[PDB]
Symmetry: D2
Subunit: 292 residues, 4 copies
């Protein structure tokens, strides 16, 4: 049993004044709220019990939007990150929710799309020791945690936001950990940047010969919705796909329904209140069409 964490906190300024009226993870990406994406990512990994971490001001809202998750067959819980001192704090804030289980952490503004994405998730989720992360070739690695490989395809280092990247592979914001993470996190010291870095956690596993780094090929799409532009590009990306397929990307109800975490009846209940619009209309159509 792995548990999941969505870290959806974070500093508004960049987005201000657009986010003067809402946290970033509540803005829509095309037709549904941002947080549905990463949420639906953990769901496709088979994770049902998930803790959502946000700012004090934003928690109640997330809560107002997702509830406890029982309607989607999930078990959701919440917690607060008073101040943005590093993603790695997630493990401290979430220490008691994790207990002695396996876990996974996904950042609230990461958005993933692609064929067999669940088999890919599956490999990592099913591992029971060490940590796994993913690597994705990008144009501006400098903006991310960067991982270097040797000629044998083996990972040999990680640097966070380097001025001189040793490769073009970035480590995305989806991480799988075993039971050693909490403790590892407990010994970190704030970076100069003054944060507790997930990169440092990852490196720790690396220094022990226990970091697994799988490639996410160029056939997948990994987008981050952190700037006005990117938000827009992602919004257009989904809309292109959705309109072409007549299917939705990252619709939690559908995924729950497909994993048998809720049944045809629950699904109908979910749709009723949304019937006046396409979303509900979509949910309804799902009960009468096989989708492979």
């Amino acid at each position: 049993k792995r548990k999941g964490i969505i870290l959806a906190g974070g500093s508004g300024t960049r987005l201000h004044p657009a986010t003067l009226a809402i946290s970033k993870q509540l803005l829509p990406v095309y037709d549904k709220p941002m947080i549905y994406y990463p949420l639906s990512t953990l769901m496709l990994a088979g994770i049902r019990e998930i803790l959502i971490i946000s700012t004090p001001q934003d928690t109640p809202r997330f809560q107002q939007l997702l509830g406890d998750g029982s309607n989607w067959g999930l078990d959701l819980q919440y917690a607060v990150q008073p101040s943005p001192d590093g993603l790695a704090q997630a493990f401290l804030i979430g220490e008691s929710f994790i207990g002695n289980d396996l876990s996974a952490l996904v950042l609230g503004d990461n958005l993933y799309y692609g064929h067999d994405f669940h088999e890919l998730l599956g490999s990592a989720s099913q591992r029971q020791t060490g940590a796994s992360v993913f690597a994705y070739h990008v144009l501006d690695p400098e903006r991310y945690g960067v991982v270097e490989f040797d000629q044998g395809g083996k990972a040999i280092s990680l640097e966070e936001k380097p001025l001189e990247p040793k490769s073009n592979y970035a480590v995305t914001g989806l991480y799988f950990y075993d039971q050693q993470v909490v403790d590892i996190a407990r010994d970190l010291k704030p970076s100069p940047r003054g944060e507790l870095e997930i990169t440092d956690v990852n490196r720790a596993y690396l220094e022990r010969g226990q970091l697994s780094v799988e490639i996410m090929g160029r056939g997948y799409a990994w987008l981050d919705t952190g700037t006005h532009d990117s938000l827009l590009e992602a919004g257009q990306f989904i809309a292109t796909l959705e309109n072409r397929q007549g299917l939705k990307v990252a619709c939690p109800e559908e995924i729950a329904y497909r994993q048998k975490w809720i049944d045809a009846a629950q699904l109908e209940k979910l749709a009723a209140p949304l019937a006046k619009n396409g979303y509900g209309q979509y949910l309804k159509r799902l009960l009468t069409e096989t989708v492979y």
Copy 2:
């Protein structure tokens, strides 16, 4: 002296589940909140005293966001629309804020761009008797109040959302009224569609020979941000303009600064708290560059 009303109420149902997270009028259009646009529209018309109407749940937010307007040289007030019974209710709800003055009403999801927009606004604003509206050729008139013209360019009828439009000219969501509006509004009867229609208000002025209908040419851009798609198209429209010009569209601070409703000092104060981002950076640059 004309007073202004922004009707920003609204059953968010359509834009669901996104608006499950925030009223429509708080979502961003590219880089600032939707409401800035229509607000900036009244501003360009010379109007400083404005009432904002919204749902009960949304009011406090709007309030949290704009304040009383003093920082921008405005005088903002607020009111509630318990239930979406027609735009025309705005005049009842707003009867005492209007008093015996001229007024103007603009819908919160209407977005206007174009050269000399302000002279255009000015013609109407400066009229002191009757009402003025604007007409804009569109592809799907059926979705709007439609106005018909005779061979002489004169307006001869108005139908709201007709199955068979008599023209391709829609009447946009910006309206100027004299002192007769409140009483006219007092005698309306809900439409079948069960609402008090602005179109009925406009028709009343028409049946008296007092409705002025100016054309807004194809050289302007009138967009409504009421669906996921249109929200996205508008976001991309502004982004294209803003990135090309290095100027913003509908930035209230700038407009206040240009009308001399606030001075260089106040402007600087407004920017300080925003300095970490481009918005503030933008505001600052405005104090040292002449922009014709």
Copy 3:
């Protein structure tokens, strides 16, 4: 050994007047000509000997753009389709180029993207008997050849452009055939619509128990660039991906280089003439970076 055909003909009037200036398959999709996409598709399927079919007016151009293929390790040939009498004509027109080999046919305005696309293609290409096609859930099946499945996932019918589609699965424009196709094509009679239909070809295989229909999941992206809008959406789709990754989609030189159909030296030669721009810059960077 399978041979390939790209059918890039037709008048393509849905794009008038853009195409008064060139054929549809020469217009760019973001940053390279349309025809590169399907071309690159056959290439990923392992196919090096390809016949390109087009209108009489367009052939020289294509021929002016791709040459004989030797620079990319291919063997390209050309042939004409005097008049748009059905995709199935491709097999008549191409009867002698096919000879007694296995073949594949891809339409010029179909564009494919996604993880493991090359294994997917590989399944079908390595089959040596019968036919294989792909089915893709879409919003408007009525526009395409539609395939229906039973409860057991087995295909049980094909209809071209039905008014009442039996499913939402469209058959895309990528087809794999054994040696029976030519003769099958020789016995077709023009449809009412007045064309020799691929759908009929497919049906013939079906009626013999020899049509293989694999599902292309919602994790892939199949777009057709036949209208102004779709052209534009695709362009923005590729641009989003390319700019995010620092990699190109459907760049024939790269693919040839990865299949060892050309070597580092050839690749360098290819890049020289393009050095003043990014495309060449891209090709150059490929010789010094490992890309998993």
Copy 4:
């Protein structure tokens, strides 16, 4: 009488390999070929007699597409620019076509949109002495001819692509000239960059007190379609406008029809051959609808 020139030459390597396939000024912007835009610009300025300059390979094509202009009430002629030695060569190459008349020069990849564009053009076109140019605030002036104003709104310098721009006002690619241009051009010496620069031509008029520089306000849109990205942004810009209005931007037939250069009958003839698609459908609808 002013005569016009469209300089639509060059390689446009920035558009490789899309432009291998065809010259830049043939690619579509959304729904019609690029060259229609600047063409339609001169048309709105009242200019009917136009010389189109292009590369030797591209001329026949342009000629294949536009003819001699009689169908649109124009008089079109062609000439070649063997090598890209500066825009200013346009005046040499076009010396005999201009004769002793007033003239105007517009670059092939400049695109213009906005309210009263046609009065703006009119001011300049009706002047009969000196030269006029327009200035547009932009984000990256370094890329263009840049003009500096004094506190009094008066132009006081022009620099082409400066490393340190003295302002954010770029001079767009539309120029009006009196009879002194040819001779002025005859004395230019190639710039270091090895071109005969329009900026030098402009500067000459400036040094004599005869250069008029009008501001094109932020209410207009000036875009250039010289890169893949910009091409794509422009396409989406026009599509947003066209689909909202049910009207086209830069449709030469319409403009001819509105200036009475052709009549209803000619217009019908023009539409026939295009009836199978929207463009022609558009042209037809124009005969029965008044568009203010």
